[PDB]
Subunit: 126 residues, 2 copies
């Protein structure tokens, strides 16, 4: 039922992504945005599988923006666009203000290109 | 054990904790200190407890604060002014920088060199 870019935050560790999303959700009073945490017990395989199941349920007509930190998580999106045909952008080295910007703009209905760029700018500025 | 103390300071219930703990488990080290600021904690209470945490750690080589956004970004300057302890602050902290930061600190590198190490990640992103 999509007027929005779906924003997925994927991070190493038990709750980095969850805590960041739960925080941006309270700051903006919004219910969008998805957290996928991969602790060191979950394989890269299994986690990519989880990304797949996840996206598929969100109706990503407007695309998916992946917010990631480092490593393999960083390349998932491109692999997904490849495998599933779903438009994707990834940002790496993500922190709270970035999640904040992304979920803010997504929920105003901005394009995937537009929200991606917004973020890369948070870095260019700092 | 007398190294640069790395304090990760973040918004949310466990962004900081989860980051510190991933990195500790990645490097099998026990150092690094997490401070989480949920919405139920006021800025002033957060600075107090940072202050009390730091006094107790007894840093002999300076303290490096890793933070996301907002007032947490200036706690570093204030703490130094208030007690004459040398701090530097990185803002927009992401797991890779907590990783680099705790790694080098573990090696016994100085504040200045670690700080520029983290700074250089954003540069090398760019």
């Amino acid at each position: 039922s999509n007027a929005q870019v779906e924003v997925i935050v994927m991070m190493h560790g038990r709750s980095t992504a969850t805590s960041m999303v739960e925080t941006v959700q309270e700051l903006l009073s919004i219910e969008s945005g998805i957290a996928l945490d991969m602790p060191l017990t979950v394989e890269v395989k299994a986690m990519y599988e989880k990304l797949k199941q996840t996206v598929v349920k969100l109706n990503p007509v407007k695309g998916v923006l992946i917010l990631s930190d480092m490593g393999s998580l960083t390349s998932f999106g491109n692999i997904l666009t490849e495998e599933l045909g779903i438009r994707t952008k990834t940002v790496t080295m993500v922190s709270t203000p970035v999640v904040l910007e992304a979920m803010r703009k997504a929920s105003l209905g901005r394009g995937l290109e537009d929200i991606y760029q917004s973020c890369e700018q948070l870095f260019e500025n700092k």
